[PDB]
């Protein structure tokens, strides 16, 4: 009779245009009986009570999918967690936005989740091509020891095998690091100077201060850094030549909300056929059995080719991820983040202005330093090596 989709947003003020987005269901596919309704509610400030604000709020309103948004407070994946557990309990497909975490990429814990924003683990794909057009061979990388840190490290090693075998030295450290310069002492013993950092937004500050006292910010050094180690306290106490990345359409809630409803509305139209179209369970008083067509509906959303919105590249892989997301490589020039290129899957360099490297050097330094001191292992063989 009426098609209603559930969604939880940051604030009720952000639901005003959400009704506007869904009220245009008359001028969409089908246009026979679909009457899209917002059915939205502001999230509870405490994520624990969210389990008490879904069964009596979302499932009670005959929802097919749920949208979860990042809260204004800088929380750590507090909002998308209870929704996924509740939605996964009934096997109803769920899709979130602005969820930049790598713990949603495995189906062992989150069976159904289709986010339209790629996580931090996809930055390593940029780093492969970004350093390839600059003639850089091998790297040394500092990676935090957690679930997020190892996610990027595993991807980079897998890709680098086909080009230059492995890296030079992978150094790991605890996520609660505080004045740990022991691992950095052996960093300047491997003639790499291509240090790639993947720490947190607050742990990277310790690395910059620790490395500054070892004159690691001078000429001949380059830094490839992710987005998390730029904003906030990381911008202060930073090398004058950071080549950190970013995202073009990231942190744009209005565009994502409009784009998210487009595929969902289009997905409902394609499911209208002669097969089982049994509605999801209604209410949370008594609901034990699971609808059969739920797994089928999730598959439809994965293979939806929506050629509109963010340059019309709305495609999903076997998991819920964005493809060809624009990154807009950023360069720091005297407290002035200046773009020096764009990314669209294949590296493109609209080199606005020029590139400044740490120490004030103009031309790009190499990442090599020949060593004339060698260490040699020998064994005791009588005719060959006496002792």
């Amino acid at each position: 009779k009426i098609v209603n989709i559930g969604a939880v947003l940051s604030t009720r003020k952000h639901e005003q245009m959400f009704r506007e987005a869904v009220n245009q269901a008359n001028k969409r596919h089908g246009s026979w009986k679909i009457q899209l309704n917002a059915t939205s509610v502001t999230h509870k400030p405490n994520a624990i009570q969210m389990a008490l604000s879904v069964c009596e709020d979302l499932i009670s309103s005959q929802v097919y999918a749920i949208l979860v948004s990042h809260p204004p407070t800088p929380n750590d994946h507090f909002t998308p967690t209870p929704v996924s557990y509740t939605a996964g309990f009934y096997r109803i497909p769920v899709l979130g936005l602005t969820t930049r975490m790598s713990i949603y990429s495995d189906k062992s814990i989150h069976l159904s989740f289709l986010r339209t924003v790629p996580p931090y683990s996809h930055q390593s794909s940029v780093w492969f091509e970004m350093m390839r057009v600059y003639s850089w061979n091998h790297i040394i990388l500092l990676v935090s020891d957690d679930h997020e840190g190892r996610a990027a490290q595993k991807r980079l090693e897998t890709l680098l095998e086909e080009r230059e075998s492995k890296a030079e030295k992978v150094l790991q450290f605890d996520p609660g690091t505080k004045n740990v310069t022991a691992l950095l002492m052996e960093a300047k013993e491997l003639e790499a100077r291509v240090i790639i950092l993947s720490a947190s937004e607050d742990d990277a500050a310790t690395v910059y201060r620790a490395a500054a006292m070892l004159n690691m910010t001078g000429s001949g050094y380059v830094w490839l850094v992710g987005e998390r180690e730029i904003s906030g306290n990381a911008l202060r106490y930073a090398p004058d030549g950071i080549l950190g990345l970013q995202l073009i359409n990231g942190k744009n809630e209005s565009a994502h909300i409009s784009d998210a409803v487009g595929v969902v509305a289009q997905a409902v139209h394609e499911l209208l056929e002669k097969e089982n179209i049994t509605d999801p369970p209604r209410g949370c008083v008594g609901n034990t059995n699971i609808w059969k067509t739920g797994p089928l509906f999730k598959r439809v959303l994965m293979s939806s080719k929506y050629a509109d919105g963010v340059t019309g590249r709305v495609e999903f892989n076997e998991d819920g991820d964005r493809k060809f997301a624009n990154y807009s490589i950023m360069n720091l020039q005297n407290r002035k983040l200046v773009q020096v290129g764009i990314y669209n899957g294949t590296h493109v360099i609209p080199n606005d202005r020029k590139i400044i490297w740490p120490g004030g050097e103009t031309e790009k330094p190499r990442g090599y330093q020949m060593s004339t001191r060698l260490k040699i292992v020998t064994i005791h063989q009588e005719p060959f090596v006496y002792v």
């Binding site: 405490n46 008490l52 069964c55 967690t81 557990y85 309990f89 949370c284 008083v285 609901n287 034990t288």
Partner: protein
């Protein structure tokens, strides 16, 4: 206080009588146990979060024993989040909340009395080598953890003097069709197949198994996670201990686990006594440092950092003609004790495909022609470049 929560109307009747029964069964110095009976029913997550939080504020309980009747494992993550939220150690003895779940949330205390697939896979191989079942096939389909399923297979046969061989398909699709599934099962080079697949998809692949005719008495199957003859599985005392021992076992871990901090100093952690009253929950430490040296009923119950049992008591279960699950062998802390004496081959728990092509031969011992040496005691199997010879009994190469 220790909370006793029972899910399902089946346990409602026995819940009332189980309270005082375990109060005097197990006693600890300086502790008191007051079991309670809960009658909550329904798979909806309404009473599991409203009553339980009210129970924490009501009776001020710490330590929860959970058991369920049906085989639905969807309720395990519900309390896993709650365990990591209010720092309440919740242990489930058997039922839906018994399958190993990885990864777990950081700063959690949920514990399970179950066996992982890596632990389950190693005990299958000793069954194969006991009856000289070197030939095997590893077949599986789209599974949440098939990545490590094959990763642990090749490492078991890498060593040892006995020579193994490997063969296996890639995946099976229930919606492909009976004809499609039958065609893809023709590429085999052995007689034994190991199965690791979801419960829902297990039935269609078994129904399609009879379509291809691969369900005779000449073949056997192993289930890792209509029913062909000769089915094997491991449940880790799933059908054993009845019910009284399980509830007693669950409270034993909590009572002795709580005393780990009590002996050092007298402290009563009431962090789990409230759910929403306090807006802060940063206070938390030593959540999983304990529960690592556990001994009870002349058994070891050590738990790993992840939060799952690492020293279980595995038991093998077979199938009889009356379509029943019965324990045939045993396993007591890496002893591999099998009952039903294993004499001859292709006559016990397995039959030849063709009787007319199974014939017996006789031999003697002549030093340059036929050499007889005893079996290898290190592995209990005959060495490579040799065949068994039962002296009509024992087993010799």
């Amino acid at each position: 206080n220790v909370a006793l929560v029972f899910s399902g109307p089946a346990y409602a009747a026995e819940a009332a009588r189980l309270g005082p029964a375990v109060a005097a069964a197990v006693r600890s110095p300086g502790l008191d146990v007051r079991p309670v009976a809960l009658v909550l029913n329904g798979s909806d997550p309404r009473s599991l979060v409203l009553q339980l939080c009210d129970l924490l504020s009501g009776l001020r309980v710490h330590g929860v024993v959970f058991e369920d009747d049906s085989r639905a494992p969807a309720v395990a993550p519900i309390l896993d989040f709650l365990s990591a939220q209010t720092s309440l150690p919740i242990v489930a003895v058997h039922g839906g909340a018994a399958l190993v779940l990885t990864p777990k949330e950081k700063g959690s205390t949920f514990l399970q009395l179950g066996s992982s697939t890596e632990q389950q896979l190693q005990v299958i191989f000793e069954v194969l080598e006991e009856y000289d079942w070197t030939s095997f096939v590893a077949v599986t389909t789209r599974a949440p953890g098939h990545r490590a399923f094959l990763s642990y297979i090749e490492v078991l046969t890498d060593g040892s003097l006995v020579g193994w061989e490997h063969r296996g398909a890639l995946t099976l699709d229930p919606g492909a069709g009976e004809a499609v599934l039958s065609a893809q099962l023709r590429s085999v080079s052995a007689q034994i197949r190991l199965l690791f697949c979801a419960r829902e998809e297990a039935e269609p692949v078994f129904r399609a198994a009879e379509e291809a005719g691969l369900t005779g008495s000449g073949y056997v199957w192993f289930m890792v996670g209509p029913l062909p003859a000769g089915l094997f599985a491991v449940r880790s005392a799933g059908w054993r201990d009845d019910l009284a021992r399980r509830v007693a076992a669950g409270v034993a871990v909590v009572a002795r686990g709580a005393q780990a901090l009590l002996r050092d100093y007298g402290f009563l952690p009431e962090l789990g006594h409230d759910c929403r009253a306090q807006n802060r929950t940063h206070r938390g430490e030593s959540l999983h440092r304990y529960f690592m040296n556990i001994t009870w009923d002349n058994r070891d119950y050590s738990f790993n950092e992840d939060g799952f049992l690492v020293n279980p008591s595995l038991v093998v279960i077979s199938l009889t003609r009356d379509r029943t699950w019965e324990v045939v062998g045993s396993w007591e802390q890496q002893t591999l004790r099998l009952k039903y004496p294993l004499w001859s081959r292709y006559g016990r728990f397995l039959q030849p495909v063709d009787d007319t092509q199974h014939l017996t031969v006789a031999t003697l011992e002549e030093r340059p022609f036929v050499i007889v040496e005893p079996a290898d005691p290190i592995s209990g199997t005959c060495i490579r470049d040799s065949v068994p010879c039962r002296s009509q009994p024992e087993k010799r190469c």
